[model samples]
Target chain A: RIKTALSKMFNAMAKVTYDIDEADGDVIVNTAFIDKKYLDEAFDILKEAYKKGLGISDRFGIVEENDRIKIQTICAVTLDGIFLRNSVPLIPKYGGILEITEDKERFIDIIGYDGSSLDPHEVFFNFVDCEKTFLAGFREVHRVAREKLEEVLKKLNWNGIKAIGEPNNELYGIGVNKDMCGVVTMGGINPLVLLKENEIPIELKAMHEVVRFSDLKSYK
Target chain B: NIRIKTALSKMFNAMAKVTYDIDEADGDVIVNTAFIDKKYLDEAFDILKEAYKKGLGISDRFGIVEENDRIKIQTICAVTLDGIFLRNSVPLIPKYGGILEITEDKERFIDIIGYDGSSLDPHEVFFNFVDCEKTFLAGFREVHRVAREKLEEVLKKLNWNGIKAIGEPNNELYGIGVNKDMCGVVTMGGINPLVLLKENEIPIELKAMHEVVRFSDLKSY
Candidate 1:
């Protein structure tokens, strides 16, 4: 049920709000069936890796029930949601496997959301002479919204957002609209992806659910 | 890549045929009949039909044959427009299979895949979502890098009107920038219906430009 709503919301480019003490907060999570024997190690890997997108921001939700563990994290699309409500609509371009070296950054491969029916998170990664690589996605915003966008950023602190490009230019080689700027954010599924890469048996459902803003605990 | 190479004593329509083939098939047209498992035949055809109706196909016409345990469907290919332009002495430079963003007044390409490295046509990769209303399959928009008086005339005369717009010289069309003396020519690509079908876990033994038939034999569905 949670996975279905997230897919619709992401595709429709809809809003994911923060329900105040009463009705305004939101988020997604994937349920993975694991052998009970490895539950301790699974928690260890997840706990160390969980956060916004690639970096650590908030503690992820983990519930153990019926021999299944559900992991919840913030989705990259939530950046768009906050911007959408703030009147700065974003156009999602593609999700890429990004490589970051000591000082340089480059995309290894990319998948466009509008063109492919499959999620970008399903296929992306890197090996660009980089020490650390991440699953990230970029979006374009109208150039005119630059001023207000910065203001929104100032008020809300988010680690998911990686970088913002110049007006009407390429952000790290990928092009943007003639009148728009590009914004980079880390992929929310990077940690889940890390788990999968380890040969762990898991069923990955991306953008899986909505948890209240207040309920989600902040972390490094 | 368009250039002035003395025209090479070119046979216009024949050259178009050599590069971008046209079915003027002298009479009938045919499609690449891909056979698949019968269990998926019904739901699979639904996707093809809806994709075709959604302007995601090269042509509206198609054929299907059912053999117990297996079913085959026919979908025509698009390599005709490049030929059409060639037939008219209009220089065209095709870049890649692109996804064009459509609007009420203006349009632009949001996604593109170059033909050089791709094992399959770019359309096959970018065509997973045919349900998009604002986005459509534009196999390619051959840029006319060299100036032309006949190219403008070609658009006016061709009965098949796929050329959306010819960008002004040295200016950008939609969001794509034109070259020094170039302008963009927009057109549709026909084959996404099959690509869409293949993307849905449907097993299809697809082929391209193999069977030949007369152009007149095709009927628009």
Candidate 2:
């Protein structure tokens, strides 16, 4: 039953698109590929999970790009949860991309703590500029970790869109015990379907695994 | 006052030695120099004024230097309420201080809180010690933590003298202040110490006579 639900969810997401144009008297009209009702329904499911303490609430937006609209999502999780669960430390030992440039490429370059010493720790995920917003999941015990991350982010400007799938344990952790099962997914220039595909680990399983319209009802 | 003068003399001598060593090794010890104006020095002056008002001793004799064919009044030194002694290399250029460099010869540095330059909010400032080869052995945070500890020791030894003037050795700006609470040694950088009080939730208004103080203000002094 879960597999069937997942397959149907993917199919619905694949069909999502947006229609942009003008209406009567030059009135502009923008429409989503997926109905608002379905989008709201899916979002409601996530909200329900948040209320149940099983998921983290994320902010998502549709950004206009080069002749197209892309979806961007953001969430926070704990850094320790990520290290403990995935064995991937999200320290700013090295820098990488945080925003999409005019060429549509992103990079992050910052120094972070490596396992042995405070050296250049390369990261796959883009570091968020803290000057804009404080990443929400860092604990008091992780003050040093938080400051290091903030240090790198302060050096850069916000690029409007960013997508990261490597689990961010620093923002906010998710799951029953609130450890490593939590995931933060954000992106730009892609639909939620592509966003999930790029971020969610393949091994991650749940009743409502796919971020799709069909799975919303099944989970609820 | 006597204790303060003694400490300041020792700091000046140590700074002169460091500069002299660098000069002997390299034809020019100063990598960069800028002549700034009084407006650029206003923020720093306010810090000195505040220290004076709070009974933290500051030298009355200001250093006068000729830059760009203009005479500029340079700030010598001011001791913080926390007993952290600070010395400015140039009149109002915000970064280099003598107390921050005292431990640089020992691989230690200090970090302080400052404004983000955009607003009067708290930000972290880090100071790093660059060697003769410009290589620093410790990471920014590691050095910053060490600086805080060393400063604590100085505060105790000086018995919070609140009176000292030290000479600046190098003009390198190595500290970084994000919008967070952290510490490190001093360097040639810009940071408003008032931000530190704000981070501790102290109800103090850090008024800025100007929206932002630019490095261009240092074009004359």
Candidate 3:
């Protein structure tokens, strides 16, 4: 049902002119018609399409997550399945979609390099990207946090390898057989940073990592 | 609830009388008249639907049974407009097996059978054309009346006379005084008592027309 509804929506949009774009190994569909008639149908199709589309996307190892924290990077794709450009990490700008925000500061940028510059269309497209980027960043943060926890548990014994300091700045000190020691590098955008600074839970961070932004093209 | 149903029934019964029907071979009531156009029928259905919303129910395919008896009755009806029919339900058309058994003794009727390829009522669904028709009519009328009234009122006060063209008070010789105390003869420059206007000036000709009538004691043009 969802596939059929999506096919109808995509076909209707294709007839009207907007082409599809691709970015981050995903299809980004574009549609412009949002009148009452089309909008009503779009919502109907979306309800059904959400069910099946989510199933199909989920089958391909793309899991759903809920991340409350903002992402640091911004990416956008063009209407013909082309990754147009990536923006400088964590810069704020108007007219683009607001992807993520922390303490009232937006940490993502929307870069439209399709020759037309930033407009409503670009804004809408970037909004879809923001959803995906936030999800991906959120998931990555949770995964790194969990891996650090596992590392601490595996190296419990030994004369220097131990967990220390606050969870956000905690170091899993590794001892290579008693005298020499090394510290596990805590990557940026970790869930612990959200937990300590923003009070966002790791479980929620994992959930946020899976919410993908759908392009207008995908809506049909 | 009873009063509401009575009102709806009256509306439906009134509609049912207007929506004349022919007793077809399969006991189906159909409006085969030539004078009634589809648009008229559509409008009637809309009215019937509104009546239904007010508590009218479709007793038979063509007739609407409102209130338990028929207090506020409306019976005018026609074949439902295209795309408005609930397809695959009990077929109400003549071509389909839409039949109702008449029980004269009880002054009532029941669904005896349906037509070829026509599906039966999945779960005892009654045909309420008045309800459907009334709803459509009520909604359409609401918007129509608002727009019509607004447009008419706006047009009523519009003045089309040209300031550049030479003209007198063609029919009306009345004009407003500068003080606006009373309607007086046309002045050199004074207020006009038009509801939509504040102040205005009339040319010498209109003033001449008013003064000539009073000064000369003459009614001639």
Candidate 4:
């Protein structure tokens, strides 16, 4: 029943999600960082989608892939390519300044914290010092994720849109009880969909199972 | 004494009649002869002679070294024109005198000698007498509307995100004087409420008044 409900919702959104294709992956997105070209491109996409009556963008909703299971998703896009494998976006010691022009697109660096590490001690050295690493890690991950998403979009043969926006410096976390571990995934327009396709079950279930969705009835 | 009294009465009556007469043949001659007239001396002497011939001469029984006696005359009170000391004229009396008498209708004459600085503009005077509140209200409305519209235009030109709201008279917008008495609209401050609140302790009531005053007197752009 949960899968059916989620599929219904996703299918419903599919009709409205412009430039979205089954083979091209489930989501298309655009976000602005610091590039005028990217900003213009993002605004252009927003305008195109608006003109097509599809909407500027769709937010991440619940995704139920398996019975008694679900996953969380988020969307990101970018306009340029970067060396994601080894190119350190951040400084070795402190996260350095990242600049991009309109011709160069990048993703936002979103941080998803698992509930288990409430203290953040393992991840944090000094509050300020750790922030630099966190930022650097986000940029690196965002680049890698966008590259992956581009690969999928290319394989699927999408011509109207070429780039997805970056989702950097945004927070993504699952709000579940103490028993669950909130999973954070990077890359892809819909992180929840990405996790489901990747067969990540625990975080998916937490996203849908923890929250009471009755309040969202009016939205439909 | 009787002859003198008759002559004085005739002279005064003739003067008043001649002065009031619009079409007198010799008006200038009559006026010139009022104070001193040699031509009327013969006439006065003739009248005195006629009076002496009558038996109405002095009846005093006084002779040289006669017995002493005293004669008393009756006190007479006569009514004059308008019951005033100076009829058909206003008296300019000296101040600080003990007895200063004025007419009974003092209030009617007050403004006659006081200052009157009423507006001379026909429209303003007419409005004042007819509908004062409406007139001022319209003025205020025009000022407020014009000011806001002008501000909006300026903001657009400057590419301002939008005026946050205007500040007080001095912070940003300067007032432009419209008249010699410094009565005119001037630009002041942005439309930013946050800025306004930060600068002063603005009460809610005053804020409302400011809004009304701000927009009430605007010109139609």
Single out the weakest 10-residue window by summed lDDT for candidate 2 chain B.
Answer: B116-125
Best by DockQ: 2
The TM-score leader among the candidates is 1
lDDT of 1 at A146: 81
Please write out the lDDT profile of model 3 over residues A55-134, one tens digit for every residue.
Answer: 11211111122422222111111111110122111111111222233433221322212111112122233223222222
Give a tens-digit lDDT track for model 1, residues A3-74: 222245465445467422343366443334555566676666666565324542465666666766666667
Top-lDDT structure, candidate number = 1
In order, what fnat does every candidate score?
A: 0.00, 0.00, 0.00, 0.00
Stretches of candidate 4 exceeding 4 Å from the true structure: A1-45, A48-74, A77-98, A101-153, A157-220, B1-221
Sort by TM-score, top down from the best: 1, 2, 3, 4
Candidate 3 chain B lowest-lDDT run of ten: B187-196
lDDT of 3 by residue, B124-166 (tens): 1222211222111110001122232332332233211111111
Quote fnat for model 3. 0.00
Q: How does model 2 do on interface RMSD, in angstroms? A: 21.5
How do all the candidates rank in terms of DockQ, highest first?
A: 2, 1, 3, 4
| Predictions' DockQ, in order | 0.02, 0.04, 0.01, 0.00
Off by over 4 Å in 2: A1-99, A102-220, B1-47, B52-190, B193-221
Per-model TM values vs. the true structure: 0.52, 0.25, 0.16, 0.14
Q: Please, what are the lDDT tens digits per residue for candidate 2 over residues B92-158?
A: 1122221132343443233222111101111111212222122211212112332445555444443
Model 4: DockQ vs. true structure: 0.00
Candidate 2 per-residue lDDT over residues A1-220, each given as its tens digit: 0112113322333333211121001111112232232444434433443333221222233334454332223212112222222223332221112333344322222211111111111112223332221122212223334344334323322222122322333322111112322222222112232222334211111111112221122222
Q: How high is the DockQ of candidate 3?
A: 0.01
Task: Between candidates 1 and 2, name the one with more favorable DockQ.
Answer: 2
